[PDB]
Ligand SMILES: N[C@@H](CCC(=O)O)C(=O)O
């Protein structure tokens with residue numbers, strides 16, 4: 345399977361709780377930089393570690409964040425039923441997702457759909473009063489790549 349990079353995240357020793365995911369929730373953080381930076385930023389605002397389970401970089405590199413076995417902090421009301429996938433950038437201002445990042449996102453979500461037997465994938469905005477993952481995020485195109493069987497519909 346694809347390379348999922350494993351790095352030490354301050355706070356990951358405090359992972360606890362439970363999660364039975366039946367959905368994948370797509371996010372942006374309005375942030376460019378390393379997963380370590382994002383982890384440290386979220387630890388400054390009441391998270392023990394990064395709220396997201398995976399981070400997909402502009403160059404298509406994928407990092408493991410919060411363990412999926414642990415209680416999540418990616419979406420209010422969905423901490424025990426979801427996988428949070430974050431895409432590097434600010435897609436409320438950035439008009440163009442690099443194709444390397446888009447393809448890595450589809451690869452990761454297909455792999456997770458396979459491992460967890462998950463149907464439902466959508467933007468944060470589907471589940472909560474937010475613009476996340478941003479007005480310019482190619483969300484319908486990405487969901488199109490994930491539902492190939494729809495071409496025979
Ligand atoms: N510190 C908790 C979140 C608590 C909260 O958001 O109120 C966590 O990182 O899982």
Ligand code: NA
Pocket residue numbers: 350351352353356408
């Ligand atoms: Na880690």
Ligand SMILES: [Zn+2]
Pocket residue numbers: 370371372418468474476477
């Ligand atoms: Zn979000």
